[PDB]
Design a protein around this nucleic acid. Structure first.
Length: 393
RNA sequence: CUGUGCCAUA
């Protein structure tokens, strides 16, 4: 516990306990890994520190490699470490340069381990955010380029490091992570993980020419475009596997749903969805994807999808009554109703596809009518019937 | 007869 010298007869930290007392004693490490003492320290180091208090603080908390790692990997001490790092960055004295270089080197030498650690990942994250960019880019360069990078992308802790890097580091400096991830085997592994798939979405988002990248110069936009194509190529080459997977389906969905990735939406729809609609519609995971394809397909593609269901080598009956498929039919139905009722754009390329939508609606209404008695036996079926009843409202 | 995730420190 906390050094005898620091306590009451009742074993309480003597109020009037000073930062300097702790720094002089050589016992800072004991307080920093204690819940109560750490809170004292964090309050203490936020005060007005003299030049020499900082000297001692810097040396004891971010100046010795082993203590630095011990505190960074500690449940309380990690907070103190981040706090001292910030003070170090706000202290424009002489040793400013040497201090940061050391810190950077301590961290680099243990990058993976610190990234994978519940508490040191927090030190990593705040360092990437707060260090001068040039230094921060050096932490990024310390990332493994082997199997360990996968481990990080899929770790509950370390995935946030990678996400932090995508938020605050220039693309030039992490381009390699993109190409690492677009590796068929890496793409496979990473998109199939509950943390990996968020990570991969976050990269795609950063790589997207949306309204959050309007500040990019033409150069930055070109670099961004190239990286996006490399990743999209890999992703489309495997859309079937990705679209049907329990985690990856969210990525396929994101892409299909995004107008700023229209062209990739279309590749996917053609690559793995088209001519597999009936099959994918009956799948737990890929059925949500099918819904998104119907909801976002350009009208000419939409027509091919509709025809596939109505008169593709019945399909409509299997889906209408399948545990998953039924959501697809409902979605088809809502799409056609909205279209007829002005809620949904029916023009594309200078031509109205209104008659097509009206043909699709006729087919659906006619089927629902004949299958009514049976559809009313089910929740899904009663919803279709209402959707149709609300048209006549 | 209803159908999927992650968003993590005292």
């Amino acid at each position: 516990v906390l050094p005898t010298w620091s306590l009451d007869s009742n074993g309480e930290m003597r109020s009037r306990l000073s930062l300097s007392e702790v720094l002089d004693s050589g016992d800072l490490m004991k307080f920093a890994v204690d819940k109560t003492g750490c809170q004292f320290l964090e309050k203490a180091v936020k005060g007005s520190l003299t030049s020499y208090q900082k000297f001692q603080l810097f040396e004891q908390v971010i100046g010795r490699k082993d203590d630095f790692l011990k505190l960074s990997t500690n449940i309380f001490g990690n907070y103190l470490v981040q706090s001292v790092i910030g003070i170090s960055l706000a202290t424009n004295d002489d040793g400013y340069t040497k201090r940061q270089e050391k810190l950077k080197n301590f961290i680099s030498s243990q990058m993976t381990d610190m990234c994978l650690d519940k508490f040191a990942c927090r030190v990593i994250q705040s360092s990437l955010q707060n260090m001068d960019l040039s230094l921060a880019c050096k932490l990024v360069q310390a990332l493994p380029r082997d199997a360990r990078l996968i481990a990080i992308c899929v770790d509950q802790n370390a995935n946030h490091v990678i996400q932090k890097v995508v938020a605050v580091i220039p693309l030039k400096n992490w381009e390699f992570i993109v190409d690492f991830v677009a590796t068929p085997e890496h793409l496979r592994q990473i998109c199939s993980d509950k943390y990996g798939c968020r990570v991969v979405q976050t990269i795609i988002e950063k790589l997207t020419a949306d309204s959050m990248n309007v500040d990019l110069t033409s150069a930055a936009q070109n670099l961004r475009e190239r990286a996006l194509q490399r990743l999209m190529t890999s992703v489309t080459n495997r859309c079937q596997e990705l679209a049907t997977n329990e985690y990856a389906n969210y990525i396929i969905q994101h892409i299909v749903s995004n107008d700023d990735l229209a062209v990739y939406r279309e590749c996917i729809i053609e690559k793995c969805l088209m001519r597999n609609l009936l099959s994918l519609s009956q799948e737990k995971f890929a059925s949500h994807v099918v819904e998104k394809a119907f909801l976002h397909a350009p009208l000419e593609l939409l027509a091919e999808m509709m025809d596939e269901i109505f008169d593709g080598y019945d399909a409509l009956d299997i889906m209408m009554f399948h545990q998953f498929g039924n959501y697809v039919v409902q979605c088809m139905l809502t799409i056609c109703c909205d279209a007829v009722s002005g809620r949904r754009q029916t023009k594309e390329g200078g031509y109205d596809h209104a008659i097509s939508f009206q043909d699709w609606l006729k087919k659906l209404h006619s089927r629902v009518t004949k299958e009514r008695h049976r559809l009313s036996r089910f929740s899904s079926g009663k919803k279709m019937i209402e959707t149709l009843a609300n048209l006549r409202s």
